[PDB]
Amino acid sequence: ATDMWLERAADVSWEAGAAITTTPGVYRIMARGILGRYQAGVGVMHEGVFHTLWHTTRGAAIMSGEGRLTPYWGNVKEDRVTYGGPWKLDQKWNGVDDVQMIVVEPGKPAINVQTKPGIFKTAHGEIGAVSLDYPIGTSGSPIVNSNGEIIGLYGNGVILGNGAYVSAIVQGPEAYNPEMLKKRQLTVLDLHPGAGKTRRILPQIIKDAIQKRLRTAVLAPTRVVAAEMAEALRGLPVRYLTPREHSGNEIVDVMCHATLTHRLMSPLRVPNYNLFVMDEAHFTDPASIAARGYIATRVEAGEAAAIFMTATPPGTSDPFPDTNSPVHDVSSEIPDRAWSSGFEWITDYAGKTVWFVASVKMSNEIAQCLQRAGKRVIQLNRKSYDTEYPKCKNGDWDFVITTDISEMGANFGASRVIDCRKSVKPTILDEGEGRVILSVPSAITSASAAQRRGRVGRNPSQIGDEYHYGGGTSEDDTMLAHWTEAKILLDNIHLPNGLVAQLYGPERDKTYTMDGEYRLRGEERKTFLELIKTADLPVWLAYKVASNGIQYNDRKWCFDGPRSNIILEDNNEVEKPRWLDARVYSDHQSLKWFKDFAAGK
DSSP states (O other): OOSEEEEEEEOSOOOSSSEEOOOSEEEEEEEEOSSOEEEEEEEEEETTEEEEOHHHHTTOOEEOSSSEEOEEEEETTTTEEEESSSOOOOOOOOTTOOEEEEEOOTTSOOEEEEEOOEEEOOSSSOEEEEOOOOOGGGTTOEEEOTTSOEEEEEEEEEEOSSSOEEEEEEOOOOOOOGGGGSTTOEEEEOOOTTTTIIIIIHHHHHHHHHHTTOOEEEEESSHHHHHHHHHHTTTSOOEEOOOOOOOSOOOEEEEEHHHHHHHHHSSSOOOOOSEEEEESTTOOOHHHHHHHHHHHHHHHTTSOEEEEEOSSOTTOOOSSOOOSSOEEEEEOOOOSSOOSSOOHHHHSOOSOEEEEOSSHHHHHHHHHHHHTTTOOEEEEOSSSHHHHGGGGGTOOOSEEEEOGGGGTTOOOOOSEEEEOOEEOOEEEEOSTTOEEEEOOSEEOOHHHHHHHHTTSSOOSSOOOEEEEEOSOOOOOOTTBHHHHHHHHHHHTSOBTTTBOOOOOGGGGGGOOOOTTTTOOOHHHHHHHHHHHHTSOOOHHHHHHHHHHTOOSSOOGGGTSSOTTOOOOBTTBOOOOOSSEEGGGTSSHHHHHHHHHHHHOO
8 A cells, every 4th residue: 555554563561681582562664665565663552542753654644453543643843643542651761770672673573672771961851862773664662661661762863973873762950040130030949959059059149249249148047057158158258247357348248037137127227139149948937938028029129139049949839859869758657756666667777867856845755765776866956956966967876856947958968867747836826815836746838848858869979868758748837827927027127119028929828917017116116126136035926015015124914914824834833924925835944034034134
């Protein structure tokens, strides 16, 4: 005939060895010219659909065993075409793994050939590359997994450097830019942790900013990261705000997330920063959320630019983002308290481990259990971070037990992460006057879990890191306190041109009240500022005091509250307040500060 027909060569299977020997399988695509019969290409029948390359048939019809088929779907640029329905192959090749091509060469019987593919740097991602030279009739031969799955077809190559023939597997990243520094621009970058993130990218951002002569605000989540910024930005005009001092020329200022927020609130003027850079932009600290609110507004106004640096941007719902190196994600049962037996896999592990816990109370019971097994352990909470975190660099440890704090800029030499996927959070009850409570261990956000997971898989040379998780994730964190405390902190920030600040777009849905409701009068506002600075009170509790019109000296509210609001310690009394906030009475240390504040200060 004029049009083509099919002849079965082999099945779709992985076969042992280097070289060996609509029914599903591999078929020769045979044609007829004036000069005789030939093989036009190869194809594979899978789930009722014949798959091959567009080049093979050029849109001709194929007679199968019984009845004729014409192209159902195709793409010239992609070099793909299907017969009898849509493209049904979707399995992808994983790097560092050998695959097997089922070679159906014109005239020769079907032979399996194992090789190791290379990589092409194409326009859309990276394209796989098989280094096998075969005559054009062989085009379309399927390439299969160890599991027998088809990961693509043998296609047309590239006419390469002086002498080469590497064929592409037919099947189917970010970059920093100087144009991001333009005033109206806000870009969310995924700086890839390791030797790439803060070693080359950040210094290059600052080098650009100084040349463009922009006054820059670079923001660290904690003091530790700010010191890492001090090492990486040596030999550049830069002022380190959060405490060798400044000359008076530098236009680049390094500070904490909170440092800028507190200054933005204070009576004095705020410098007109043309550029904002924020590392660990996913930080759910009230002063971080509010800082992202202010920045997003000035960028929207055309007064400033923004670059947010985080692996998990505000709005993420993916618990397993693509890592640098391959990782094993294992669903396992994680202890919430000490254990006397079982759990051999935890203590038998030779390398270092980072265990995430729900609370400082969970950290104590688990670590006390582990040190009884002769295991060197460091405990890391929001209290003992600056002190105990630097010890982790030494390597004198087998286990690191930590709270949610470690999600923000923590470098561990560890190979395994144990995650309970829970945490104790301050939550708000709005009924009547209000109550802030420390929740029972609850399922964290998937963005937060991906940060806990992101402690491993960083090293491009170290592969197959382990990540053990127990329980699912949850996105209903609207009940939490840090949302309201942020918009309280945001309403009290002033903007010129009769403007009021608003939260960063992706986070606006979390809290909805009158915009600028929490803005306070000249005497209340100044009193509220001293309650968070001098007295170290939670933002919610400090607002309640100032809101009603209580002065900074007047301590009466601590003793004239409702009869149900009396404070307890050891099941005994303590010498209540008008409003309750668990953060000031839950543990012995903080409760001691609250009763000093109560008595006289």
